[PDB]
């Protein structure tokens, strides 16, 4: 699962 921004 890509992390597009920060880990959420």
């Amino acid at each position, epitope marked *: *699962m*890509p*992390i*597009w*921004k*920060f*880990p959420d």
Partner: antibody
Amino acid sequence: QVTLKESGPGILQPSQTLSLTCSFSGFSLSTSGMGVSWIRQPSGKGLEWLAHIFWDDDKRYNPSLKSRLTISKDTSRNKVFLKITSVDTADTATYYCARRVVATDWYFDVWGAGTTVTVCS
Amino acid sequence: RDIVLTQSPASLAVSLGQRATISCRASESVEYYGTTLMQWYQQKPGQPPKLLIYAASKVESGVPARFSGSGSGTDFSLNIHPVEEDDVAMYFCQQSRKVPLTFGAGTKLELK
């Protein structure tokens, strides 16, 4: 290759605004998943993250410094900017910018060499 | 609140050919759904920091096989063996689990 270069005023009197510029080449900050952080190493201390700006102009700040910081970008000139208001001796540091590209992990893959700013006494 | 990274030693004087180990302890877990958001960087004077290790144990391209990363949860270590002249540098850890991003305070690796 990908290069990042920080530039600044070199010296700055206290209470003035610090304006830093990260000039980059080899990629576009408009590409989906790109982002750039500003980081600093104060004199005699460890590194400290300041702010990060994503390809879609989403901005994140260090909560301890948020009220003093403004990150921004101009992708037409391949530049990222940082403004720090009301500087004092605690802002004397080498300032770095670094890129992060979307992945399943989260890491800076390329850094600049840094620019040193001295806040005058 | 913030994840504090405690990196030791501050200074490492090593003999050429020996093993050097650098330690990072986090104030809380840096794990995130099957990945560990802990990085190691090398920095030479006047040069950009270079990524060595990401996700605790993955080696970045162009990094010598003398470098390895290990650890889980809160305890991480960087291992250099054998130490060579090119390894004289500043090293630091970095976590990406929570904002603000935070860094270890650094290890200066010098030769005796």
